[PDB]
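Reviewer 2 asked us to include a model.

Predict the structure of this chain.
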Amino acid sequence: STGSATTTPIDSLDDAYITPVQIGTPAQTLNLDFDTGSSDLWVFSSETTASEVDGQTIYTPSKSTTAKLLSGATWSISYGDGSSSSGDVYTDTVSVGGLTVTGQAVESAKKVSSSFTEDSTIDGLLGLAFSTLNTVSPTQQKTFFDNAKASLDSPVFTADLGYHAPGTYNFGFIDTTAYTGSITYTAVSTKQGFWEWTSTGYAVGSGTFKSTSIDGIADTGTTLLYLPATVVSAYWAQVSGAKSSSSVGGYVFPCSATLPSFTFGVGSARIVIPGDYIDFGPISTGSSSCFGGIQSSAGIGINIFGDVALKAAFVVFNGATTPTLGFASK
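Predicted model (structure tokens):
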């Protein structure tokens, strides 16, 4: 089997991407944030504290003939921005782009933190990291991909995120029309539960390539590109007036700037992020200070190849017995 679904930016800055997912019988369609950095499929629901729901579409298990309470199971998760959610668990039928999994753990939120409530466009998350990170207790649950894998034509999914435009998540096949040139594959460590790999270096604008190993994760659920302070300083030094602002929480730059591109290495291959992708607009409405899309990972504990990086590539998440990651230009 295969599946193919369109993923769409939630706003004009590509702050996140949503993908329609069918849950239950008859189908209840929710728009979920596909997140290769976590491993829980959770949704706003009829159980979510009413004051914490503001415009989201909710899953109502009592209206699904295939829903079953997973008795005794609870979940609780927190993300890198300090946001969080928790609740109980149902099993139900879940379909993405025509690919159906029966018996998928659908984690129903009883509570969500403020930044989820305030995001009216995101109805929940669909985790695509390794199932070892799943938070369900006392019986850990499998991701949608893990459950689908054996049925897929090939044990892979691909992320093709757009810049200010829709893109695609495919399951079970590689669309050879969706990228240019060849795909370069690189090794993955699953030791921390992530799609963790080592970039071979970087360049800023038209500058020379610096060969240096940068360990990080391919994370569709993180908006920005978070890299070591040395790398990030070298980038922003090429933008007149750019500075790190403690008050804003990262590098800002004059909105009048033309940002240079940023290149990262994948083996001997190179992915170029255009300068436009690095612009996250005014820090507050009407400001002439703009927020940068490349930020320091210092104090995060890990480097993160988030959407800013991934949307410059066609990315293969190869879930074979020994997982790997592939990147192509597009």
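The radius of gyration is 20 Å. Helices lie at 114-118, 144-148, 229-236, 307-310. We have added this to the supplementary material.
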